[PDB]
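Same chain as my last thread, 105 residues:
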Amino acid sequence: CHFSQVIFNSVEKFYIPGGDVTCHYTFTQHFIPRRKDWIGIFRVGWKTTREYYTFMWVTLPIDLAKQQEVQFKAYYLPKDDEYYQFCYVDEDGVVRGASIPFQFR
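reply #2:
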């Protein structure tokens, strides 16, 4: 009971370049999502929350646990060969989730 977190589900090992990506995530029982939380795509080994490459506001559960999702459009997604991951950054800037790494290949 030390850290309410966001758990990313069904994370692929790789995503085909040029294709849209849907990010699946669930909340722990005691995590409370807030208005300006966001799920950002970061390079692995990032150090600050401002190092995101693209982000999406959280699909705010309008009625408070179930499977959530957010769709990342291929136009905002990276095209290089680096290792990336999903990260849940809440309103206050602390990261509550970090997904398994993946590439865009």
